[PDB]
Write a protein that binds this ligand. Structure first.
Ligand code: ZN
Lengths: 105, 105
């Protein structure tokens, strides 16, 4: 509700690229490169990523596990998916606890 | 936020699939009853709906039986997406509308 930066924050692609895993036994970095673009992502060897090498990615798609920063995916995927993930998580915890309520609210 | 215009007059909407993909299990599954019941009950269709031979007129309000029918229609595999008027898409300014809101619970 406060759109605060997650503690466990997970990285997300900024475009629709291809995946390239690169690990020099220091930093496990995963590049995401398009046809006319490219950018890498500095990632720690600890948190396991969700995308296997060579795979195709989508805009704002999560590369690693953990909560997604609201503003981050906002300027990536779009406002549509934003609303979605927001309410989806709130209902995640609420439904988990065993309290049902309409999404409208 | 107050209901002012009974109809804002927008065309926008959001679809809400009844299928939430199970993680580590891959294969998609139907959102258990309470989940769907909490999203489609007291709603208003944004567009026409065809499946199982019965037709849902655009602008038809939903009740328990309605959402249950959609559930069955999903299980049969005739529908997945659910076009509805959301409080978000609502163009009512400084408030909301009827069609975009729903049933007074
Ligand atoms: Zn409205």
């Amino acid at each position: 509700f406060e759109a605060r930066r997650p503690k466990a924050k997970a990285v997300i692609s900024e475009i629709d690229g291809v995946v390239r895993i690169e690990e020099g036994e220091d930093r496990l970095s995963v590049f995401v490169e398009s046809e006319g673009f490219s950018k890498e992502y500095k990632l720690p060897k600890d948190a396991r990523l969700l995308v296997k090498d060579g795979d195709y990615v989508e805009a704002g798609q999560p590369l690693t596990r953990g909560a997604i920063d609201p503003h981050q995916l906002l300027e990536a995927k779009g406002p549509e998916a934003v609303e979605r993930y927001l309410v989806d998580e709130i209902q995640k915890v609420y439904r988990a606890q065993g309290v049902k309520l309409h999404d409208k609210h | 936020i107050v209901v002012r215009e009974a109809d804002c007059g927008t065309t926008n909407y959001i679809s809400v699939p009844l299928f939430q993909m199970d993680e580590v299990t891959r294969t998609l599954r139907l959102r258990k009853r309470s989940d769907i019941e909490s999203g489609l009950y007291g709603r208003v269709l944004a567009r026409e709906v065809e499946a199982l031979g019965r037709r849902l007129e655009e602008g038809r309000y939903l009740s328990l039986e309605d959402v249950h029918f959609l559930i069955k229609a999903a299980e049969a595999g005739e529908v997945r997406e659910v076009p509805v008027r959301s409080p978000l898409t609502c163009q009512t300014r400084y408030g909301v509308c009827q069609k975009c809101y729903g049933y007074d619970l």
